[PDB]
Scaffold this active site. Structure first.
Site, PDB file in Angstrom:
ATOM      1  N   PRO A  73      -9.946   0.113   2.595  1.00  0.00           N
ATOM      2  CA  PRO A  73      -9.957   0.428   1.170  1.00  0.00           C
ATOM      3  C   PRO A  73     -10.046   1.920   0.830  1.00  0.00           C
ATOM      4  O   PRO A  73      -9.288   2.406  -0.001  1.00  0.00           O
ATOM      5  CB  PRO A  73     -11.224  -0.329   0.661  1.00  0.00           C
ATOM      6  CG  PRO A  73     -11.269  -1.542   1.592  1.00  0.00           C
ATOM      7  CD  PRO A  73     -10.808  -1.031   2.953  1.00  0.00           C
ATOM      8  N   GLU A  74     -10.905   2.671   1.528  1.00  0.00           N
ATOM      9  CA  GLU A  74     -11.083   4.055   1.168  1.00  0.00           C
ATOM     10  C   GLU A  74      -9.835   4.890   1.389  1.00  0.00           C
ATOM     11  O   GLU A  74      -9.505   5.796   0.622  1.00  0.00           O
ATOM     12  CB  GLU A  74     -12.233   4.627   2.018  1.00  0.00           C
ATOM     13  CG  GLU A  74     -13.575   4.109   1.626  1.00  0.00           C
ATOM     14  CD  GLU A  74     -14.008   2.807   2.329  1.00  0.00           C
ATOM     15  OE1 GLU A  74     -13.220   2.012   2.939  1.00  0.00           O
ATOM     16  OE2 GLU A  74     -15.241   2.573   2.274  1.00  0.00           O
ATOM     17  N   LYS A 111      13.990   2.429  -5.053  1.00  0.00           N
ATOM     18  CA  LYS A 111      12.881   2.279  -4.092  1.00  0.00           C
ATOM     19  C   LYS A 111      12.975   3.415  -3.093  1.00  0.00           C
ATOM     20  O   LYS A 111      14.036   3.507  -2.384  1.00  0.00           O
ATOM     21  CB  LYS A 111      12.970   0.924  -3.403  1.00  0.00           C
ATOM     22  CG  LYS A 111      11.739   0.645  -2.515  1.00  0.00           C
ATOM     23  CD  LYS A 111      11.786  -0.749  -1.892  1.00  0.00           C
ATOM     24  CE  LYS A 111      12.758  -0.859  -0.690  1.00  0.00           C
ATOM     25  NZ  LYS A 111      12.338   0.016   0.413  1.00  0.00           N
ATOM     26  N   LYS A 158       4.095   0.415   1.818  1.00  0.00           N
ATOM     27  CA  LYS A 158       3.558  -0.621   2.716  1.00  0.00           C
ATOM     28  C   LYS A 158       2.081  -0.403   2.980  1.00  0.00           C
ATOM     29  O   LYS A 158       1.590  -0.632   4.075  1.00  0.00           O
ATOM     30  CB  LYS A 158       4.394  -0.662   4.010  1.00  0.00           C
ATOM     31  CG  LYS A 158       5.747  -1.237   3.707  1.00  0.00           C
ATOM     32  CD  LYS A 158       6.779  -0.740   4.626  1.00  0.00           C
ATOM     33  CE  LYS A 158       7.015   0.699   4.272  1.00  0.00           C
ATOM     34  NZ  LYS A 158       6.978   1.600   5.469  1.00  0.00           N
TER      35      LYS A 158
END
Ligand SMILES: COC(=O)c1cc(=O)[nH]c(=O)n1[C@@H]1O[C@H](COP(=O)(O)O)[C@@H](O)[C@H]1O
Ligand SMILES: COC(=O)c1cc(=O)[nH]c(=O)n1[C@@H]1O[C@H](COP(=O)(O)O)[C@@H](O)[C@H]1O
Lengths: 215, 215
Positions: free
Chosen positions: A67-68, A32, A62
């Protein structure tokens, strides 16, 4: 995930991050990588680790925007070679769907972060976490992150997402979580400082794996 | 903030981001740089913009991790030359305090994101947003972000944080928000696509500023 153990590589120096990852590579198949390392050394570190270690890379970013902007973050992250990205569910379903759409376009995976492991998660995230998990199920998410520090919450999360979804869990070691208890519910544990700040990271990883095998 | 207008520079190409920022520099004193640009071109872009344009830089990183990781993200961001960083409040007070502690150590500022501008913010963030704002007040936060798309929410936010706190607001233009209405409550507006995707960004910025002066 090899040995059900994912290394959280949050050292901020490429030389130290490479040393420690190399030392424990026999005991993991998945690293990670988050912003402490990427913002210090650049996004090229993801492909370098993938090549050098032949590991899978989960970009722990995170993602938590509209959305864009989430689309753009995910595209840049998969362009850099990440296998999967961790996404917050708190911003809602459109923000998560934007990340799922880019992962579908680029043949990658989204992990949905449902409830966080630190004490402050109790203030706002915990009360929304079951709903965030159910939202994930209804969007088709198959990979989730939930807290080692609260195994009763991790059991409830598992109950919502079912036995076929993949669940990984941070908060083991430094934050107080236990490997074996956490693996009652999660498929894999995430471990950072207990390994990367140890005097002997390979011995720290081997000790954890010994305790996992016994389960 | 010059003209109460902050450019959200979310182009992903250094040449295009430099061109557009240069073209509109006469009309702003502050550029918001986020992960679309930094993950595509590197953290060195922050100091390059600060030098080239002599602007203030707000790093829109939405910091949303546990306290220890938030510390590391903030240190790396201020090391790169950012003047301020945007932090999510949803992860709770310890996560915000970790960012405040690093900003105090490095002589920088934290902006607390309270309620987001996109439709999905209604699912979980909006119901927690007044509390997140009150948490900010109780931690001593003086700079906040709230949504142009919901001016009634932006009025409630302003009511909680008081008249001395600084409030900036995204969602103007592309997402549907209005400059003048938003500036009834916010001190400055954030504008991205309405400027940076315009055929003539300077004309787009000038048009917005003309409408701000009239207020
Ligand atoms: C999905 O994001 C995470 O990995 C994350 C979520 C969370 O709730 N808790 C949490 O600790 N993490 C991350 O997991 C790592 C834990 O590392 P640690 O073992 O505590 O040193 C670290 O990178 C944290 O940023
Ligand atoms: C603090 O973070 C933000 O700037 C942010 C929060 C939010 O609720 N809404 C929001 O749009 N933003 C950011 O502000 C910018 C809006 O750009 P736009 O004018 O819509 O192209 C863009 O960078 C978003 O990521």
């Amino acid at each position: 995930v090899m040995n059900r153990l994912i290394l959280a590589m949050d050292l901020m120096n490429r030389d130290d991050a490479l040393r420690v990852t190399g030392e424990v590579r026999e005991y993991i198949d998945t690293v990670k990588i988050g912003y402490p390392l990427v913002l210090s050394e650049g996004m090229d570190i993801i492909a370098e680790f993938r090549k050098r270690f032949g590991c899978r890379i989960i970009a722990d970013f995170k993602v938590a925007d509209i959305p864009e902007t989430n689309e753009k973050i995910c595209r840049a992250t998969f362009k850099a070679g990440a296998d999967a990205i961790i996404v917050h569910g708190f911003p809602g379903a459109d923000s998560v769907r934007a990340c799922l759409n880019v992962a579908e376009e680029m043949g990658r995976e989204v992990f949905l972060l449902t409830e966080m492991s630190h004490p402050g998660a109790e203030m706002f995230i915990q009360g929304a976490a079951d709903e965030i998990a159910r939202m994930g199920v209804d969007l088709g998410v198959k990979n989730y992150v939930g807290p080692s520090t609260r195994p009763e919450r991790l059991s409830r999360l598992r109950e919502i997402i079912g036995q076929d979804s993949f669940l990984i869990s941070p908060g083991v070691g430094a934050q107080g979580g236990d490997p074996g208890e956490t693996l009652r519910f999660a498929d894999a544990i995430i471990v950072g400082r207990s390994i990367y700040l140890a005097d002997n990271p390979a011995a720290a990883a081997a000790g954890i794996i010994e305790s996992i095998k016994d389960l």
